[PDB]
């Protein structure tokens, strides 16, 4: 009954995904834009010779948004899909657990997009559901 999770920020707003799928976190450099494209995706980058789509988490959620601050992309891979989430910076992996995990999943505004909201040392760490949010983007 022990969680491990990758946690990051968005203009001081903490969140986290499950390291289960997190592939890696590259430092955002250049992001070639894809014209006339669903505005919640900032474009595509070249990762080790393959083309990866960099979606903007801050915008996909609808939160504190500012660009010259977001310097980290969280590449993740599902069964068939691969995406890069752009966020301000990643604090890193964290060891969370049942006791620490709280659940007022009816509390946060973004429905299923985010599982329960957990806290540690008095923090607003929202536990987002990757495999789900990504599926929200693909389909």
């Amino acid at each position: 009954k022990e969680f491990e999770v990758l946690s990051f920020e968005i203009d001081e707003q903490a969140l986290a995904f499950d390291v289960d799928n997190i592939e890696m976190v590259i430092e955002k450099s250049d992001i070639t834009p894809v014209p006339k494209s669903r505005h919640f995706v900032e474009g595509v980058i070249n990762l080790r010779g393959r083309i990866i789509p960099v979606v903007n988490l801050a915008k996909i959620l609808g939160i504190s948004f500012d660009e010259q601050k977001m310097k980290s992309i969280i590449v993740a891979r599902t069964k068939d899909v691969e995406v890069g989430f752009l966020v301000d910076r990643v604090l890193g992996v964290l060891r969370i657990t049942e006791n620490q995990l709280d659940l007022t999943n009816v509390s946060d505004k973004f429905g299923k997009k985010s599982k329960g909201l957990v806290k540690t040392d008095g923090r607003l760490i929202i536990y987002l559901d990757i495999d789900k949010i990504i599926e929200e983007i693909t389909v």
């Binding site: 006339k36 691969e82 992996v93």
Partner: protein
Amino acid sequence: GSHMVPISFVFNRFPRMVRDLAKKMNKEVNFIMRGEDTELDRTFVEEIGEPLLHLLRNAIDHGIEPKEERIAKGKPPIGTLILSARHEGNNVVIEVEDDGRGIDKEKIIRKAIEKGLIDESKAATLSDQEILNFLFVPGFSTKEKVSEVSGRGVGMDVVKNVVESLNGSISIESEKDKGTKVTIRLPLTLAIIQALLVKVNNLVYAIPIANIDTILSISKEDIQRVQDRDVIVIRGEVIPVYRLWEVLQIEHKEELEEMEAVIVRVGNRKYGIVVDDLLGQDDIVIKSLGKVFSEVKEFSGAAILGDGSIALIINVSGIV
């Protein structure tokens, strides 16, 4: 078209990375590379790279056995790592071979069961190979994710993913105490198309030469607006033309004085794309851009220009 390149290009970083991964483990390895000139598509060199290094690593990490344990099994002290490449039909073949502790299919099956993935009677209709394919199946190596989380890399499921993304494929061949040998086969001829690389504000786009009727170099005046449409005339014939930035609503200075107008044909109709500058002709490999973009009609894929910058590929018929 001479898109190929000798595999040396990827193989030379290795003889050294091998020599070092040995020290960081005290294993004595006689690394051999053979076929260090087998030409494979210009592309592969950047992707095929990490997977091979990974394989290369395993051998030295798990495969090759430490001196002692090695003399104990009556195997010369010095292990053997072999990186080879060759052509075998319509494919390029790259294999990483060693004579280490093997892969012991017997327990890989067990593990395969305890993870409720295979029935016990069913697991008999397997060939040593497929047994090993489990080695790929996601998280079939527990670990923890960490080393991978963001550190020194971990996982084959990817190595497979990669070679599979290259329309290729791979297999493992192993027997306990007789080393292992992974075999990657990539295609020898790709879906290469010829296109004119065209620019629009340091954004690069590509137009299949296979549709280009003729290219012209016009001025920001030759484009005359009728009622709505914008057209140009060439030795009579009026040819409708689209300003690429506007077609893609792209923040644009305004427009220089001089430009270029690519005139392409689709079925029975012809028109023209207006751009800032020509970049040149080239052979690119059309790579699709995820599902996060399926919807976008204007582009029929993307490509990785040599210098490593991406260039979206224009879909003649997809534009208005």
